[PDB]
Amino acid sequence: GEDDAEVQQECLHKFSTRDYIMEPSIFNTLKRYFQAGGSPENVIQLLSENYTAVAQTVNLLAEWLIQTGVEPVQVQETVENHLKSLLIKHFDPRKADSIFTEEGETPAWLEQMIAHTTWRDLFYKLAEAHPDCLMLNFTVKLISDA
Amino acid sequence: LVIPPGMSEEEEALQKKFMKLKKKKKALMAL
């Protein structure tokens, strides 16, 4: 009949992974957990036991580098290029077009990405490697129409 | 560094064995 015990452990697994407290999916995962009647007390345990603070550890490395004389804007550019590298590797046109058909209006973050010139470069490099994708053609036109 | 100039008994015996061996090696050489 009911899923409840399979779903529960599917969720307890994610709770165990590294720094799951940082993941955007954690809200969806917590709702699946409770709609499947999961007791909550051991969830706080899993999330805190497996917290490593990788992201805060990046902040530390950055300020250390800056204190030793690296220009701040350059640490920023390394960090941005890593986001940019991941986005180019995993770029799926069907996911991008889903941004559009999930709501006719565009999301607020698209018009915000466009204010930074490195993100506009990412969209241009994306518009070449995938010339017949709809979300990129829209975004390049949004930039141009600015 | 001080040594008496005269030879000891063991020294003179050595010099005698030296000469005994010279003779033997000459005799071996010819006959």
Partner: protein, 554 residues
Amino acid sequence: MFAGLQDLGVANGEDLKETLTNCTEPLKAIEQFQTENGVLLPSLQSALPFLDLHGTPRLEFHQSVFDELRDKLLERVSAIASEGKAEERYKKLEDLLEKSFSLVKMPSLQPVVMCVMKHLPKVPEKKLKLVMADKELYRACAVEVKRQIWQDNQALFGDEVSPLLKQYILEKESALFSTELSVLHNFFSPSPKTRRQGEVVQRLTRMVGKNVKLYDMVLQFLRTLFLRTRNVHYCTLRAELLMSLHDLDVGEICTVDPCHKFTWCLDACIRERFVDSKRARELQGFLDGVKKGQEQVLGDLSMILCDPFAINTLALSTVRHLQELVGQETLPRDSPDLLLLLRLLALGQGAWDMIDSQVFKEPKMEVELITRFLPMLMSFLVDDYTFNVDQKLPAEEKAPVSYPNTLPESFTKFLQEQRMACEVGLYYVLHITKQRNKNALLRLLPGLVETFGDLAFGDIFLHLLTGNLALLADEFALEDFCSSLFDGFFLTASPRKENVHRHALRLLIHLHPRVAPSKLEALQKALEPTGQSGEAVKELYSQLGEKLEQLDHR
């Protein structure tokens, strides 16, 4: 993933737990934690949705940033340590140490902290003590840091060098008692350069680095252990150490150890197993160059000469000069080269007596050793030369010459009352054995039964003697040769001295097939473990057992 994060105002897992427990609005708490503890780069906030939309986890973004930035910072630390003016150099690295050190037990960050200390000539002593207190910090950090700890905690240094010494000494004993009996190679065969590649002396060289103070501590350890144990192998290691730093061009030590040039000269003679005339005269000059008031360097020159490898080369050289003084028909008194070897040899053999009660005077040279003892030694040579030629001559007639089997009483008196006479007589015995001169050997073996300091029963002489006795392995079929060596020599001392018990069994094992079986069984009975004996002769006595039952299948 650790406590040190709180030291820098950054929440960790316990902070998270206290935040979520009994929270009136947990999901709001989570979303705030997410923004307060992510990468604090405002330009990311608009683009992270784009990554979230593709299902790529934030962990993969954060981790890959972390790997690059960490490597770049490691590179930057090396760059800062080899750049610019000194105080700017180490100020930047000290500042970074004060920041990052509270994170030293996080696995992802410990390499940064380790690298920073690795490049800091003077890690601050507060930090050093905190490193020394924790076993896994201390053990997993660079030798540049350890040296700074050792420099100011001698007992910890000592606890590090004691197990290396122990291994060394055990290796030296295993080498003198390995059942690898050979005339081709023996204990004194490997070159100084080869021996200096061993793992103990290389580890000691690495621990010392260029730190004069650590080197003095190692010298001090070797002196103390040499004094307490009389084990001459500690002298070899003191030589090997200084010579290792010589080959590594470590001038910070070599230019300030007054024994350096001496040891370097002596090391070339050891490599040739001979002191030629030039290096002899240079050794003489270092000896004569001992300035008044610094007479205790004599003690240290002695120790380096007490190196068994040095002793072996001096004794070999002495026996060679006798041999070629016979050809030149010259007396020992008339050979200045010979007196010089004797001077060096006497110092080496006296080293421990010197260090014991600090009387730093060269030993008195006994006139009679040059005028009486060495002359009797050369007589045995001339005798043996005369016997050889007596055979190549015809008409032996009555009395085909009998090999002289007589020892002048004064000879054995020198052997039993004088360190140096005993030593060179021992090496003259080693020579005739190597020549498999069965006649000379049987003439001299009696009167090795009682020697100064039981020197004829030392491990070094017995290792070489038994090694050379393989060249004569066939002679062990005859039982009066067999009993001349066992009943006449080895069994003289095997009940009282354990190592002689051990050597005797080790020679038998190597020679078991050649020995007449009824004599084998008798010797076996005479070499039984005496109940108060140690594990080494018990295992050796067992090895005899299996070899003597395996030989019975022929």
